Write an enzyme that holds these catalytic residues in place. Structure first.
Site, PDB file in Angstrom:
ATOM      1  N   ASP B  64      55.158  31.805  20.925  1.00 22.10           N
ATOM      2  CA  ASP B  64      54.530  30.773  21.742  1.00 22.10           C
ATOM      3  C   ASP B  64      53.085  31.167  22.014  1.00 22.10           C
ATOM      4  OD1 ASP B  64      55.109  32.758  23.790  1.00 22.10           O
ATOM      5  OD2 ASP B  64      55.144  31.175  25.299  1.00 22.10           O
ATOM      6  N   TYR B  66      49.413  32.054  24.053  1.00 24.29           N
ATOM      7  CA  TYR B  66      49.031  32.985  25.115  1.00 24.29           C
ATOM      8  C   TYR B  66      48.997  32.182  26.407  1.00 24.29           C
ATOM      9  CZ  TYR B  66      47.527  36.461  21.657  1.00 24.29           C
ATOM     10  OH  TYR B  66      47.511  37.372  20.618  1.00 24.29           O
ATOM     11  N   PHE B  77      48.192  34.640  17.391  1.00 23.96           N
ATOM     12  CA  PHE B  77      47.457  35.910  17.482  1.00 23.96           C
ATOM     13  C   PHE B  77      45.983  35.799  17.869  1.00 23.96           C
ATOM     14  CE2 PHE B  77      51.037  37.453  14.757  1.00 23.96           C
ATOM     15  CZ  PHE B  77      51.528  38.398  15.650  1.00 23.96           C
ATOM     16  N   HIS B 187      56.895  44.256  14.533  1.00 22.64           N
ATOM     17  CA  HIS B 187      55.831  43.486  15.197  1.00 22.64           C
ATOM     18  C   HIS B 187      54.678  44.432  15.590  1.00 22.64           C
ATOM     19  CE1 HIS B 187      53.876  41.046  18.386  1.00 22.64           C
ATOM     20  NE2 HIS B 187      54.426  40.005  17.785  1.00 22.64           N
TER      21      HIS B 187
END
Lengths: 82, 223
Positions: B64, B66, B77, B187
């Site tokens: 989702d 920020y 990102f 990740h």
């Protein structure tokens, strides 16, 4: 909020830059203890100490605290179950 | 649909009339009166405006947006200037720095330079309510993004999918590994960064697969 939860345990008011969702065994492999549910890794970065402070809670919208992980420059993780 | 690239629209338009989507839009519109919701309207489908659907070469899947002011702008990102790179992005930069020879930390965290080159930075859930992570999940977005991934899987060829973390890896389970190249590892989050991301060299490898496929590599330093 989760931030004051962090300030409570560290004494430093940190800003959460991101919250990454991870699966229990994904977390187990890292933490050593398998969480029962999906973990949201709320991460803030302490420039002062050069540490990555991560408040791990359960998935939205309860967000029940499960652990506080502190990582230092040499890449060492310091787990502190809640 | 406004703020939606026309070439993407010409291929994903069938999703807009389905009830799950109408309900999703209703719910989103609703919250944007009583909750601060990220990203702003003109930046929910930023990924559709960065490049043509037929020019997509690499796909990076996120979760989702920020949940803080000035960060999220419709690309996974990425954080718009002047917001400093969040932990995960700084680790991606750290990996690129030893993976790609001519790479240099761009100071910023705006990934639009990649988006324009055909690097689709797609999040699974396209909105979140300010300060509550994973708040807008189970509202229809995941199904919509599934459709996007599905269309690319069937109608494109030789794309490279970069799946970091188990969530992303699950969303990409249905990708045809014989038609596309999939690369997966842990990740980039500080928690799992040492579990495989550091040293994965996905950026060099992505360019190798591209060149071999007869497509121009990504200039990762172009940020």
């Amino acid at each position: 909020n989760l931030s004051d939860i962090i300030e409570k345990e560290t004494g430093k008011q940190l800003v959460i830059q991101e919250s990454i969702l991870m699966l229990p065994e994904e977390v187990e492999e890292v933490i050593g203890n398998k969480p029962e549910s999906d973990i949201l890794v709320h991460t803030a970065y302490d420039e002062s100490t050069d540490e990555n402070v991560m408040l791990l809670t359960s998935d939205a919208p309860e967000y029940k605290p499960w652990a506080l992980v502190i990582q230092d420059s040499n890449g060492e993780n310091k787990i502190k179950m809640l | 649909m406004e703020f939606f690239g026309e070439s993407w629209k010409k291929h994903l338009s069938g999703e807009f009339g389905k009830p799950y989507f109408i309900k999703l839009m209703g719910f989103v519109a609703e919250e944007r009166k009583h909750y601060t919701v990220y990203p702003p309207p003109h930046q929910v489908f930023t990924w559709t405006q960065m490049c043509d659907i037929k020019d997509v070469k690499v796909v990076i899947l996120g979760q989702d947006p920020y949940h803080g002011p000035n960060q999220a702008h419709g690309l996974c990102f990425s954080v718009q200037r002047p917001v400093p790179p969040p932990p995960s992005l700084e680790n991606i930069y750290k990996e690129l720095s030893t993976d790609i020879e001519d790479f240099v930390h761009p100071g910023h965290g705006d990934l639009s330079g990649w988006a324009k080159q055909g690097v689709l930075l797609l999040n699974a859930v396209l909105t979140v309510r300010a300060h509550q992570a994973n708040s807008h999940k189970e509202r229809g977005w995941e199904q919509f993004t599934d459709a996007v991934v599905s269309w690319l899987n069937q109608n494109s060829n030789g794309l490279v999918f970069l799946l970091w973390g188990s969530y992303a890896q699950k969303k990409g389970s249905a990708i045809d590994r014989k038609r596309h190249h999939v690369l997966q590892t842990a990740h980039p989050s500080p928690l799992s960064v040492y579990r495989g991301f550091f040293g994965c060299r996905h950026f060099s490898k992505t360019n190798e697969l591209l060149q071999k496929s007869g497509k121009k590599p990504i200039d990762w330093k172009e940020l």
